[PDB]
Amino acid sequence: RGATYTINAAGEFEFSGRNEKWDQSLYLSEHFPALFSDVPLAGANTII
Amino acid sequence: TIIAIMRLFTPQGFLRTDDLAIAANFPRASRNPQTYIPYTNQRGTVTNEFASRFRTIVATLANVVNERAVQDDMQKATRSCTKQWLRHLETQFDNIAV
Amino acid sequence: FFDTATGIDLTKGIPLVQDLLVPIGVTAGAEQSAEYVSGLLMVLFKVMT
Amino acid sequence: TTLSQSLSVAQVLSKLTLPDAFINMILSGGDSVVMRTYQTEADDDLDEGIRMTTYDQYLSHIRERLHITNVPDPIYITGASTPDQIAASVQATHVAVVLYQSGVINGSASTYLRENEVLVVMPDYYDVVSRFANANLQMNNNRYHESVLEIADIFDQADFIQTSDAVRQLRALMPTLSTSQIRHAIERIAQITDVDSTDYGKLTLRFLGTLTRSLKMQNAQIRRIRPDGTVLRYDDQIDIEAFR
Amino acid sequence: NQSAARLVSAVKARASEADISSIHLAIAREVSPMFNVHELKKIAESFED
Amino acid sequence: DHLSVVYATMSNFMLNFTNNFSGNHATFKPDQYVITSPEGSYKPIIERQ
């Protein structure tokens, strides 16, 4: 699904689909941490 | 099973031509001078794709040493200290595969 | 009121401040005409404060 | 113990940008663009005519100040534009600025652009007379007066650009300024008026404590930005009223 | 206890650093403004055992 | 019982003037105000430096 996700202006979660390490320079930007999305995904319900 | 364990000795490399040696017009003893570099450069990756090969080798070797252990009903403690060591080679391989 | 504490020199009739808006790139004695303009600022600044 | 430590910070920094604020209130309209004035008929002045500036000049000075004053974008006059439509852009965007796109602007709108002094923004000074329907045939490619146009001459707000009759005189008496002379003017008023401070107030100013002269304060406002990195316009429903 | 020596070497090992009284400081971080972006003290772990 | 009433009164102080959290980790970001200027570069408030 992705390691970062952005907020679409209509309100949907646009997951990036890339495996990247987080840095705190991305804290000011539009990307979020994907573990804290609280969005259930099929098959990975234990990580959620 | 014997063929399956011999699929763990396979190399994890690529086949690079001698691009800087042919253009330098150096002596070579073949038609296409190609050497075998053991592992690809791994820039920008979170999970290292060469260290993850050793994850899947030990996961097969921890099933070979488990079936050999329970065939001779050895201790739970003497088997657990083997598999703790087999994943201590997991951790020490991640430090150097970078 | 516009005493020597605020750097306004009312001796010559007009307010004069020495080193507030000096013009650059001129002869070293040609900055006196810009003192009246800086003098009107510190009069405006003192009424405002 | 915490009230007197909170007041003595809010007292100090309220007067710390006090000489920062005074000079930039006087010079809030000191910025200027380079316009041209193409004369249109026989025996005109240097300033009577169509007032025109470039898109590269528009994008720096004028466009960044229309996204602050929260107006729509000015319209693209395309040659088929009636002078009612240009009046719909002066009444929407409170400055008389219109953008050019293409076409040949007719002489009906050319009489409108002369009387109301509407600033026409061109993308280039490349064959300028051919873009107008020169029916009177007095407008020439080499007939203009490239003069400056200050920002206070085209804008007027109560709390954004100080442009009254008094400050209009003082910028005419000031010499040719710079970003090194305005920085000298702030360091001189800070030398004259040494501010008051309590026992806790001096402890904060020697803690921060020296760098002030980095940020420009010309028409400085408080706005939000996107996480992209672009400055958003003001919104009546998201920001507090004190930031408008 | 001997069998929990693998556990107590990771609790003490974590426990030993965090400073006191940074505990007093932190509580002030749960309601201060943020002007510099905070960042995590580097916890280099392996998640082996 | 005793930490919570300290957070309820430290959040009413004068200089703690920003909202800090809004319940959900999934959407909250601090509002990034800047000091914009048409004659210079904007300087952000919340800025990792």
UniProtKB/TrEMBL annotation, chain F:
Stated name of the protein: VP1
Organism of provenance: Bombyx mori cytoplasmic polyhedrosis virus
Taxonomic classification: Viruses, Riboviria, Orthornavirae, Duplornaviricota, Resentoviricetes
Complete-protein stretch covered: 700 to 748 of 1333
